[PDB]
Amino acid sequence: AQNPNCNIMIFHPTKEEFNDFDKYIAYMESQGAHRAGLAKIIPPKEWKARETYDNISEILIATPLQQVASGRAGVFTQYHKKKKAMTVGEYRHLANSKKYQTPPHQNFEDLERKYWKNRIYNSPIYGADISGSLFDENTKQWNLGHLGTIQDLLEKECGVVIEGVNTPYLYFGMWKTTFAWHTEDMDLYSINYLHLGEPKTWYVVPPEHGQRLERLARELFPGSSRGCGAFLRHKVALISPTVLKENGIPFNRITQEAGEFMVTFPYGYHAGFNHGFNCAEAINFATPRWIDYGKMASQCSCGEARVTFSMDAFVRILQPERYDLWKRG
List contacts with ligand OGA (CB under 6 A).
171, 179, 190, 192, 264, 270, 280, 282
> CA-CA distances (angstroms) from residue 116 to 76, 138, 147, 206?
11, 41, 35, 22
The distance of closest approach from Cβ of residue 302 to ligand 72V in the complex, given in angstroms and rounded to an integer, is 6
Residues after which the chain is broken (C–N above 2.5 A) are none
The distance of closest approach from Cβ of residue 172 to ligand OGA in the complex, given in angstroms and rounded to an integer, is 10
Residues 278-307, interacting with ligand 72V (CB under 6 A): 299-303, 305, 307
The distance of closest approach from Cβ of residue 201 to ligand 72V in the complex, given in angstroms and rounded to an integer, is 29
Torsion of CA 206, 258, 198, 183, to 10 degrees: -30
The distance of closest approach from Cβ of residue 302 to Zn ion in the complex, given in angstroms and rounded to an integer, is 3
What gap in Å lies between CA 315 and CA 150, rounded to an integer?
A: 13
Contact 264, 179 (CB under 8 A): no
State yes or no: residue 75 binds ligand 72V (CB under 6 A): no
CA nearest neighbour of 93 among 136, 121, 125, 68: 125
Q: Is 195 annotated as a binding residue?
A: no
State yes or no: residue 322 binds ligand 72V (CB under 6 A): yes
How many residues does the structure list for the chain? 329
State yes or no: residue 224 binds ligand 72V (CB under 6 A): no
What gap in Å lies between CA 160 and CA 20, rounded to an integer?
A: 24
Q: Is 126 annotated as a binding residue?
A: yes
Which one of 9-17, 42-50, 269-277, 321-329 is the stretch in contact with ligand 72V (CB under 6 A)? 321-329
* Binding region for Fe cation: 182, 184, 270
* Binding region: 126, 182, 184, 192, 200, 228, 234-235, 270, 300, 302
